Amino acid sequence: EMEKEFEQIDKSGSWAAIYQDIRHEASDFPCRVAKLPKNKNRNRYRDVSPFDHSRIKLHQEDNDYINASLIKMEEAQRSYILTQGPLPNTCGHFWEMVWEQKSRGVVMLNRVMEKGSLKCAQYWPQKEEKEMIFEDTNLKLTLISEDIKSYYTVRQLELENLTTQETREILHFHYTTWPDFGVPESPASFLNFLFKVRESGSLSPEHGPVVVHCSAGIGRSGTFCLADTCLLLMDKRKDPSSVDIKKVLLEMRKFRMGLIQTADQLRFSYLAVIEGAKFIMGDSSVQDQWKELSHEDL
Numbered sequence: 489e490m491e492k493e494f495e496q497i498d499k500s501g502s503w504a505a506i507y508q509d510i511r512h513e514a515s516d517f518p519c520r521v522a523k524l525p526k527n528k529n530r531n532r533y534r535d536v537s538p539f540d541h542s543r544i545k546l547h548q549e550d551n552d553y554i555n556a557s558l559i560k561m562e563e564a565q566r567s568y569i570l571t572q573g574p575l576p577n578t579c580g581h582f583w584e585m586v587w588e589q590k591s592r593g594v595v596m597l598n599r600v601m602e603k604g605s606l607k608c609a610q611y612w613p614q615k616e617e618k619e620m621i622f623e624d625t626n627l628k629l630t631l632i633s634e635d636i637k638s639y640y641t642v643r644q645l646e647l648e649n650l651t652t653q654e655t656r657e658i659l660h661f662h663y664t665t666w667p668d669f670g671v672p673e674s675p676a677s678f679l680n681f682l683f684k685v686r687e688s689g690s691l692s693p694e695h696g697p698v699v700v701h702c703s704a705g706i707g708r709s710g711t712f713c714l715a716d717t718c719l720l721l722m723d724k725r726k727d728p729s730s731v732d733i734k735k736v737l738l739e740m741r742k743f744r745m746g747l748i749q750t751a752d753q754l755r756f757s758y759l760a761v762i763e764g765a766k767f768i769m770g771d772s773s774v775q776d777q778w779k780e781l782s783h784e785d786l
């Protein structure tokens with residue numbers, strides 16, 4: 489049981505060991521295409537690559553590679569696509585994937601610049617009058633509106649397939665106060681953000697899988713996804729006790745390496761899930777508490 493285990497791991501201050509155990513048992517699979525010489529400039533990080541068996545394939549004959557993985561959680565019945573922050577040369581590829589995979593939402597957990605370096609390219613338009621056109625993939629992206637809150641921003645975008653002139657609305661959830669290698673301000677602000685994404689309908693099985701990215705697409709993105717899946721599993725069985733977080737994380741790690749980077753991110757995952765369980769089990773009252781406490785209005 490997660491709540492009891494959390495006390496014991498936290499009483500004996502052994503999160504580092506518990507976290508290392510997961511790294512030890514983690515799946516290892518080949519990443520051969522990601523390592524092909526022609527895809528060197530398509531990877532933000534030399535040591536972070538998508539497994540061949542779960543990588544998203546761009547629907548083009550030229551080169552189908554993008555550093556993105558399809559994390560399909562069979563039991564929970566929800567899929568996510570975790571990817572790196574798009575590079576100045578992979579933005580077309582990024583939106584091609586969003587279009588091809590029929591995704592409706594994009595969750596960004598990082599800022600364009602962090603600790604003095606550029607962790608992600610500016611892949612979306614910042615002003616309505618200056619839309620972006622990706623010539624290589626033939627797509628057009630236009631900022632339609634945006635609701636800015638204290639620690640996160642929700643943008644409404646219109647993506648157009650120039651070849652067919654087909655149009656889709658894409659919701660963009662940008663968490664701006666999540667430190668790289670760090671954890672959210674509190675379980676509250678995290679859950680508040682998660683439910684925003686949830687209420688947008690972006691996680692609905694009627695849509696393609698939601699795209700989740702940070703800089704490398706495994707640390708923060710990993711934390712985000714583990715928490716969501718654990719709450720969904722718990723929700724489907726309406727029994728928080730039937731959820732093994734570590735086992736769930738190890739299952740995710742079969743689809744993409746390195747998910748969740750620090751022992752504190754793992755500890756925080758517990759925090760978020762245990763708190764979120766309150767809502768799942770009938771306490772709809774907590775949702776307002778998380779909003780009031782995230783301080784999103786400032």
Ligand SMILES: O=C(O)COc1c(C(=O)O)sc(-c2cccc(NCc3ccccc3)c2)c1Br
Nearest residue numbers: 533535668669670702703704707708745746749
């Ligand atoms: O989102 C965050 O909190 C942090 O995100 C990040 C980074 C960032 O935001 O700058 S860099 C990075 C990274 C890059 C190369 C190797 C390893 N570590 C070695 C490794 C690679 C693959 C699997 C397990 C360990 C980590 C990770 Br993750």
